[PDB]
């Protein structure tokens, strides 16, 4: 058995969010109950509801107002519709399979998970700025450089360094929501003998705007 969620990655505030679970390997009219849960940011989990293989629904009473779980038995799919959404609904939704009765005992089993973000941001490409040390902070045997990727929406963004060649000594921080847009930085560390004598560039791709941009980090003199 294989479960797969699909659906838009952003719904707008006060609108309905819909997600699809397509089941292969198994029939939804056969046996089990077919569930939705979600993982908010900060990692707390919550069960939303299910639809039995006979079409009876049970909904978490905290959502009773706004939830609707339905199914197309033709295409072996079931659906979550969450209405009148706001920011607290930004989460990672999982579909899943549970036993409907207590015997025979069934393992709960989850699909892949799919993020959906609630927001009114239009789609915006990042501004990319080099992060180089003040001229001159104290040198040691190693020197750290960065890239500030500011003001983009939505996620994700991918940062590399000298295309692939700088795997080592690299970190990209998770994005933070500045003012309805996202910002992050990436850090790279290299022998200070080799910089600035060898160029070091960050390549940043923002695929939701078909944006790639390269920044050479140059010394601040």
């Amino acid at each position: 058995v294989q479960l797969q969620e699909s659906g838009p990655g952003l719904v707008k505030p006060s609108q309905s969010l819909s997600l699809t679970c397509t089941v292969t390997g198994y029939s939804i009219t056969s046996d089990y109950a077919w569930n939705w849960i979600r993982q908010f940011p900060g990692n707390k989990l919550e069960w939303m509801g299910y639809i039995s293989y006979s079409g009876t629904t049970s909904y978490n009473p905290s959502l009773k107002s706004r939830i609707s779980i339905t199914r197309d038995t033709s295409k072996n799919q079931f659906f979550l519709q969450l209405n009148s959404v706001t920011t607290e609904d930004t989460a990672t939704y999982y579909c899943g399979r549970t036993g409907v009765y207590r015997y025979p005992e069934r393992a709960p089993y989850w699909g892949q998970g799919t993020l959906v973000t609630v927001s009114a941001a239009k789609t915006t490409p990042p501004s990319v700025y080099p992060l180089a040390p003040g001229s001159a902070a104290q040198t040691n045997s190693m020197v750290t450089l960065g890239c500030l990727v500011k003001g983009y929406f939505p996620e994700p963004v991918t940062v590399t360094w000298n295309s692939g060649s700088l795997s080592s000594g690299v970190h990209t921080f998770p994005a933070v929501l500045q003012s309805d847009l996202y910002t992050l930085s990436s850090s790279v560390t290299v022998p200070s003998s080799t910089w600035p004598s060898e160029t070091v560039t960050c390549n940043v791709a923002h695929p939701a705007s078909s944006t790639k941009v390269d920044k050479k980090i140059v010394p601040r003199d």
């Binding site: 069960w47 989850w110 998970g113 850090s187």
Partner: protein
Amino acid sequence: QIVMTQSPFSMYATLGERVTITCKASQDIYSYLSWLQQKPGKSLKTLIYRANRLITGVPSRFSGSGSGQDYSLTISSLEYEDMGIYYCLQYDEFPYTFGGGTKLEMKRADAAPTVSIFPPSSEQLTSGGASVVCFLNNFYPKDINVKWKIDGSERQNGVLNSWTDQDSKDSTYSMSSTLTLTKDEYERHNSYTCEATHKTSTSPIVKSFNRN
């Protein structure tokens, strides 16, 4: 609504070590209890059902037990794979309910942060914005504090922080702190300083620069 309480919230461990996570229910739930795993940056995957039934494919170092309201997950001999967040789930009553999760992290020796401060780039100042960045890299353990200082005084608002998940190569953590100002404000002050406080030092690591 059945409340599920897990302990510990967080715990560092070593390869080969034996580990025991507990989950407390607010009612007898008759072993209608499942344990879920989430390896870092990955999906929820059920490991155990009806308290002690181990799903096939799941390695035998995992086991669960308990009854009534008190339940446990133990790992015989912790392996690298097993780091992550582990959750409990009761399915005896609607609404089905989850524990807060318990985070299993990897043990290692203390490390001081490498701290760097970066002035605003020329280009950002041309757009009329200023963002001063401080990387606190490759420290251990997690618990770290950062403090911004401008012309001597501490700064609280206009500061955003980002923390990495434990590195799955060297077992360290890192943090970015960013202080976003307008060009107008930025230009009204000469000295910019972040300070990292960390159990490795009894005084902070301090990086500063001067516009000039």
